[PDB]
Amino acid sequence: TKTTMDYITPSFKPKACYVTLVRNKELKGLLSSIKYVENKINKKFPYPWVFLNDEPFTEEFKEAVTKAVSSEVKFGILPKEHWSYPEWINQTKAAEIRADAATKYIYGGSESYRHMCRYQSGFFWRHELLEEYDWYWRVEPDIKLYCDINYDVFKWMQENEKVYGFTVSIHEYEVTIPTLWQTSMDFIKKNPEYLDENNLMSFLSNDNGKTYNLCHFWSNFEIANLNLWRSPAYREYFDTLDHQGGFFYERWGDAPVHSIAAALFLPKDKIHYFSDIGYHHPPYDNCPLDKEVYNSNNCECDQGNDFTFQGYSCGKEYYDAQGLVKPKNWKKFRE
């Protein structure tokens, strides 16, 4: 029997790319993100940058982006089948759901946000432009890279045999994923072979699977191996969630979907937290706490606003599940 890791070890310069799903109307915020990535790592360790959109990019947009990125840029449009209601979804039901949740939770009434979530969950890793790569680094507009990155991150992932890399983790607003967990546990019950014997269940749960603690990796920042999403386990998992309906009948985000899959389908030493990469995605920061890393890489963030060990973050849950020794002053963040 070929296992999930059999689909990944083969890929252990790496074939990697930055990948960005973005709207034309977000040009100023994207250009900003690009300037950070350029200055902190891309001019030193260049990798192609793929930009995707559910609509065609404007010439003004492509012209601006092409000038701002020093490495090769690729622009692609999303196939409509990766951004439209599946045949089995009741659209009237979905519309009433959005109408009702319009003011209930962030993006509650948004139709586009849900297609985006489903896209990031099961289709961005199948886009034509990503076929040739084994790794991607997701980047969004209005992001900051607080520090210089003095090593090739993709190369590091390959050499160290890591599969999923992140910076921020946090507890999800449960009102958006009421049935996500139960749906995922039934999946594992019918497919025990996909549950890695040495997985990270402890990050996701405090009672060994009974319930979800809502913890997940913040997907706006990911540096991972595309073959995880391309494995049989993940494909079957996504298809199950896709038929259940939560992307549209609730508001399932790709972050909790990617995270449950990573934390359950892989040996836990395949997940890696980039404690050394300064990053901000509104409204949270990951600011290197190690003095030497912080100084050497000229980090521009306030260590005191590092979200990692704050109550609502899941940095504590992650360190404990991995067995990592938390930095000595972590408790100060819970004040």
Ligand X SMILES: *[C@@H]1O[C@H](CO)[C@@H](O[C@@H]2O[C@H](CO)[C@@H](O)[C@H](O)[C@H]2NC(C)=O)[C@H](O)[C@H]1NC(C)=O
Ligand Y SMILES: *[C@@H]1O[C@H](CO)[C@@H](O[C@@H]2O[C@H](CO)[C@@H](O[C@@H]3O[C@H](CO[C@H]4O[C@H](CO[C@H]5O[C@H](CO)[C@@H](O)[C@H](O)[C@@H]5O)[C@@H](O)[C@H](O[C@H]5O[C@H](CO)[C@@H](O)[C@H](O)[C@@H]5O)[C@@H]4O)[C@@H](O)[C@H](O[C@H]4O[C@H](CO)[C@@H](O)[C@H](O)[C@@H]4O[C@H]4O[C@H](CO)[C@@H](O)[C@H](O)[C@@H]4O)[C@@H]3O)[C@H](O)[C@H]2NC(C)=O)[C@H](O)[C@H]1NC(C)=O
Ligand Z SMILES: CO[C@H]1O[C@H](CO)[C@@H](O)[C@H](O)[C@@H]1O
The answer to whether residue 38 is catalytic is no
> Tokens standing for 44?
């030193």
Nearer to ligand X by Cβ, of 92 and 208: the residue is 92
Report whether 91 contacts 97 (CB < 8 A).
Answer: no
Interacting residue with ligand GDP among 53, 121, 286, 313 (CB under 6 A): 53
Assess 12 for contact with Cl ion (CB under 5 A).
Answer: no
What amino acid is encoded at 12 in this protein?
F
CA gap 49, 69 in Å, rounded: 8
Map residue 201 onto helix, strand or coil: helix
Do 42 and 8 contact (CB within 8 A), yes or no?
no
Q: Round to whole Å and give the CA distance between 218 and 164.
A: 12
CB-nearer residue toward ligand GDP: 54 or 317? 54
> Does residue 26 touch its own copies according to CB under 8 A?
yes
Q: Is 32 in the site for Cl ion (CB under 5 A)?
A: no
Nearest of 295, 249, 255, 235 to residue 171 by alpha carbon: 255
**Residue 172 binding ligand Z, by CB under 6 A:** yes
State which residue, 89 or 195, has the beta carbon closest to ligand Y.
89
Indicate the residue among 281 and 316 with the shorter CB distance to Mn ion: 281
Q: Which partner from the list Cl ion, ligand GDP, Mn ion, none does 84 bind, CB cut-off 5 to 8 Å by kind?
A: Cl ion
Write down the least CB distance from residue 293 to Mn ion, Å: 25
Contact 4, 33 (CB under 8 A): no
Q: Considering only the stretches 9-17, 169-177, 236-244, 260-268, report the one whose residues sit in contact with ligand Z under the rule CB under 6 A.
A: 169-177
Is 37 in contact with 261 (CB distance < 8 Å)?
no
- CB nearer its own copies, residue 133 or residue 284: 284
Are 250 and 114 a contacting pair, CB within 8 Å?
no
> Least separation, in Å, of the C-beta of 102 and ligand Y?
11
Shortest separation between residue 105's beta carbon and ligand X, angstroms: 20
Contact status: 290 vs ligand GDP (CB under 6 A): no
* Catalytic residue (one of 172, 222, 250, 317): 222
Query: HSE (CB half, 13 Å, CA atoms) of 121?
Result: 26
Residue 212 in contact with residue 180, Cβ under 8 Å?
yes
* 90 sits near ligand X (criterion: CB under 6 A): yes
Site residues for ligand X per CB under 6 A: 90, 92-93, 96
Kindly list the catalytic residues: 222
